[PDB]
Amino acid sequence: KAAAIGIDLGTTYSCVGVFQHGKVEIIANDQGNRTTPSYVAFTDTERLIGDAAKNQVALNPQNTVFDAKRLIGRKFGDPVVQSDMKHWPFQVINDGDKPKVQVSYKGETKAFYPEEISSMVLTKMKEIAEAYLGYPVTNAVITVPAYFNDSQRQATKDAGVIAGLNVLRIINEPTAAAIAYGLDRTGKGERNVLIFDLGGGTFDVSILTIDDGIFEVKATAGDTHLGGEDFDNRLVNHFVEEFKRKHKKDISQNKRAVRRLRTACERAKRTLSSSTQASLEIDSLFEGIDFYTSITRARFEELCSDLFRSTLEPVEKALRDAKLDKAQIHDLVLVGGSTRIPKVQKLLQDFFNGRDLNKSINPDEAVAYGAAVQAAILMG
Numbered sequence: 001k002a003a004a005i006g007i008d009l010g011t012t013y014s015c016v017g018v019f020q021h022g023k024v025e026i027i028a029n030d031q032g033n034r035t036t037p038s039y040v041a042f043t044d045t046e047r048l049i050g051d052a053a054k055n056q057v058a059l060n061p062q063n064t065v066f067d068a069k070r071l072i073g074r075k076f077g078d079p080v081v082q083s084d085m086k087h088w089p090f091q092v093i094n095d096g097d098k099p100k101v102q103v104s105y106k107g108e109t110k111a112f113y114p115e116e117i118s119s120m121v122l123t124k125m126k127e128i129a130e131a132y133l134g135y136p137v138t139n140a141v142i143t144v145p146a147y148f149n150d151s152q153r154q155a156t157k158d159a160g161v162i163a164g165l166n167v168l169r170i171i172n173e174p175t176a177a178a179i180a181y182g183l184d185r186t187g188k189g190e191r192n193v194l195i196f197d198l199g200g201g202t203f204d205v206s207i208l209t210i211d212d213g214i215f216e217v218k219a220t221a222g223d224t225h226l227g228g229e230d231f232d233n234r235l236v237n238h239f240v241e242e243f244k245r246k247h248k249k250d251i252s253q254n255k256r257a258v259r260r261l262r263t264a265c266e267r268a269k270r271t272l273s274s275s276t277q278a279s280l281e282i283d284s285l286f287e288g289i290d291f292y293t294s295i296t297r298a299r300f301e302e303l304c305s306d307l308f309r310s311t312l313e314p315v316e317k318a319l320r321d322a323k324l325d326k327a328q329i330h331d332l333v334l335v336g337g338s339t340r341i342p343k344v345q346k347l348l349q350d351f352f353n354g355r356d357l358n359k360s361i362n363p364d365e366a367v368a369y370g371a372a373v374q375a376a377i378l379m380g
């Protein structure tokens, strides 16, 4: 009766969809955004989630949590966890070999499991859907990277249950993307599908073989630390140098200034996917000095040229592992907000000798879209 929802719980942005009245609808949140930051923040008086949390990140770096997906289902001693901890502004502690994020909340020290943090993000996605539908949601399909192990899948499901959702199924993100494009339905025989997923924090390449609605992972490649945030970083360093040239001041030490500049760069970056230039206007960036400038799409491409180019190596590697030539791939599917960058689409298309790309569904919404279709199917 009530519709089930599909939820892409991303490392950096999450998205929710619902199949209703013959179509999938990706649901906009309170601020009108089709995707919501996977951020949670704790203050002296409240818990903020999504846009409201990410928006005050510069003001409260120690108690604003993100990247919970990097910790979920892992052991404190996991080398990945130990490595990732070096770069986060928030504290992570060991609780029975399970990591917990420790923060200050309402004047006290409190710690939360990764699934608790993600349950908050999922709760927000559930509320977003309920606001649109006009009624409560209690069924959902949630997605995870194809390489997640049983523990990571269990903890992701636990996050959903904590959020008040009955988790119909946990399915792989690349499978969800294929379902969004109706690729789960094939003619006689098997089809080889390549999912090129470049998001905010990670880059995943997956080669799937689909046969009669059955999905098999033939190969996976990528880089868990390559994504849109790295492109934002190249822009930040470029503007830090511009500010030095213009004002003979180095703002790299001011945390607030660098965070505000990063936020502005992410917006300018998005604009450069549709327009050829973008302007950045930051009032009182550093020592009361305003910073108003512009940057062109070509300059952005130059600043990230090596990073963009590097995305084709995992594609080559995945093909090698799957024992397939480029011509044997039947469909190319774009996933992740970073694949909206024209240069990235050109590199992939050129690498595949001119093949058209499946890109009619916003890339950062494709996983949630498929998850919603799967959820509707499962509800019968």
Ligand SMILES: Nc1ncnc2c1ncn2[C@@H]1O[C@H](COP(=O)(O)OP(=O)(O)NP(=O)(O)O)[C@@H](O)[C@H]1O
Pocket (backbone or CB within 6 Å): 008, 009, 010, 011, 012, 013, 014, 035, 198, 199, 200, 201, 202, 203, 227, 228, 229, 266, 269, 270, 271, 273, 335, 336, 337, 338, 339, 340, 341, 363, 364
């Ligand atoms: N129009 C755009 N042009 C370029 N980049 C964009 C655009 N829209 C969103 N992005 C970036 O896409 C990234 C988010 O991708 P998205 O797929 O929504 O996140 P995700 O699912 O969490 N992926 P991941 O971080 O790897 O788990 C961020 O770096 C956004 O800044």
Ligand SMILES: [Mg+2]
Pocket (backbone or CB within 6 Å): 008, 009, 010, 011, 012, 013, 014, 015, 364
């Ligand atoms: Mg996402």
